[model samples]
Target chain A: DIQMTQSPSSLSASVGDRVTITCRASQSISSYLNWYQQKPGKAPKLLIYAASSLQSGVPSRFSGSGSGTDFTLTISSLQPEDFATYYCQQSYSTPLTFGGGTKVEIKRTVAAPSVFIFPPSDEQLKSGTASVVCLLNNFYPREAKVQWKVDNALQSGNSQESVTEQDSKDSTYSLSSTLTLSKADYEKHKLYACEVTHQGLSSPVTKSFNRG
Target chain B: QVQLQESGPGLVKPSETLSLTCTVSGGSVSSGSYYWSWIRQPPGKGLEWIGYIYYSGSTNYNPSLKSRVTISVDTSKNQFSLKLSSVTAADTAVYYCAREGKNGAFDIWGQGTMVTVSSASTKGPSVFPLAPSSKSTSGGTAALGCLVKDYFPEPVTVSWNSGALTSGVHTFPAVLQSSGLYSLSSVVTVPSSSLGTQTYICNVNHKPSNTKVDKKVEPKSCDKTSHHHH
Candidate 1:
């Protein structure tokens, strides 16, 4: 029996959110792939057969594309009822095998993530320079706005290095920003704050640092 | 209009035989042209072919179930019967009767009758370690997941350390794998800020074994290796 694996495993999306799920077979199974949707406490329903053909009575918004060992199920526009588990099965041989399912769940409003600031490292402090780190942790729906402010004003002449990451387990997002400041400027700054605006919160999340 | 109706006991004891009869209406079981067959669907599962008996009393069965399946006909009563022996809960399904033409097409099908093969066998699930996904900004959501597979005699209980979560959580149904085992997955979303500082645990309870397995999720920081160079 050929094994099947699905990516991301699960995702959180809202109505009208376009979502796509991928399934890859261990060996080439050609167009023998099929897709099914399973809602709680109900039998799995055939959605797409032979890789990309929609089943009878299924809506046009649901489409499947790909062939051979790789396939994709794309929901052009998600509907409320589309929040369910989707699975891929191969009918190429006996002992028909299925992939680990991809679960599409309703988008949710989560709690505001925690913010923290890391002080300048000893090496940077000794070198007459400061690299202050501002981290935004654990939030949902990836899109977010972040800013660095010094004494209530946006700082100038400084380039901030930033990065974003999503936790593999929870599907939340995090952003880390590092501001490089000269020793003279680091000493002059009263408060260096990291401000974040996200759909999860109404007001910006601010974490500040005061150099003593 | 010719019709097919299947009749059988609603429930059968484990380790016993299951018997069902399909009665033909406005048609003849002795008609030399068609074959009588039995098909079944386990609750929430796909269909399975048991076997088929021709009007001439000849029969054929699914290779996987041939040893345990028996098909017989009674032309005198215009009916065909099926007997499946040494049953288990895995055999519980909705049984249907159909008319198959010599050209190999099922043209008429009966409304199905439900059958429950009751009892239990012990096989605890192989629970994998909890895997945590990255999260959104501070105060936003983080995801935690676990894969529980190869369990038997199900209705497994899965929970997180926080206990009793509604939104941002889903546990898929245990799927019947070809090896006669079952597998499933459960996931929960928590605050992103909690990823590295908070410890999350996945707890699973397999009834037959009456054993509860707990796997702890390792804390994670932003994976710098996964950082995008802008």
Candidate 2:
């Protein structure tokens, strides 16, 4: 693992406050750093990596910048729940190194996501390769795990970068997950389920769809 | 059922040695043919390979994690161990024990346990959403759209403070964008009569983002398009 050093350790902020953190790489990693946020007992969340790209449903507020040996992640306006520690790992090389963590200690307050299934095209369904999309809507706390099941068996081949778009209007966010299966599986009309677990949910939610 | 147990300290100061043991039951640790391994993942995150140590393959190192991670087996105790010196919060992911043939080929796994490193953990995240833009139809009923973008840590819900939204709704849940951020939009439909009176609060509950956004929207303010927002 390469050497990584993070700063401040932690900070305190209120809702709507702008906060920033830094991550440094011993050698030039050229934007190869990935960032994640951790809140209490919740799992870590992907924030920025891939040249400052935000994760699928991360709010537009959090941002990562810089190049080569240095990088920075910033929250333009701290959300009330943004009060967790964040970490960064340099992916430019092997022996991935994740920085300790940075958090905005806070003064606060306190959000569901929905999913849709796009029926496969008739032609595509018959073609042996069919696509069914499960679109998720309005939800929050930014850490969501999407699991796709085909006939109860895990389907890992058919998916994308999770499409999480922020409603510029309300500030909350939405998500979309996709899956593709062979014609045999699609025609079987078996139960297809999208199981999602979030830190915000009291119980995990799994949405299943059959036929169109 | 015999299980794999991860026993370790809860907290470790900055630069101290972090040691952990994964004991196996129902099976001998020195079975001589097993390859028990160690893996770590941050709370609620994906798995991160630390190192693998067992009686399986002749090789014991991952080449990458070998620097700070050390794996050794105590066949007498029917268990294996890992030691990482000079550890910090960076080494604090939840660690687990597994059975594998070789590196990264985990066949069985343990529930996993966490060991936190001392001190702090950065950067505040942001939240931005457009105000509810409403559209009144020529025919009596009405439709409203609220678009929220770029929020993180991912659990959000949308609601109307008063009258119910149209019984049939179009909801697109959140997604982890390739850019590494999360985003999306939401809309709710309502009867035209549900409008024209007091301001209807289009409340979006982004749990923990701040209180749900309660924007007062008098029907008059619903003049904008209901499609998508910037």
Model 1 interface DockQ:
0.03
lDDT of 2 by residue, B1-230 (tens): 55677776655667888878888888776655666767687654544656566575343554755677778887778788888888866776777777653212333567566666654321112222222222123244444444444454344566655446535344455565444444444445456675655355556655433445655544332223666568
TM-score of chain A of each: 0.52, 0.50
Candidate 1 all-Cα RMSD: 17.9
Query: For candidate 2, what is the TM-score?
Result: 0.33
The parts of candidate 2 lying over 4 Å away from their true place are: A107-212, B1-93, B96-112, B115-230
Report the lDDT tens digits of candidate 1 across residue range B58-117: 777777787899999888898888999999878878787877553313446676776756
Candidate 2: residue B101 Cα off by (Å):
22
Q: Write the per-residue lDDT of candidate 1 for residues A1-212, one digit (tens) a residue.
A: 47788876878886678998999998888788878776644445668877787776789999999878788899998876776678787766544456777878766557466665554544345658565555555577657677888888886545343333333345455555556677888888788877878778788877776652
Best by DockQ: 2
TM-score of each candidate's B chain against the true B chain: 0.51, 0.47
- Most accurate candidate by lDDT: 1
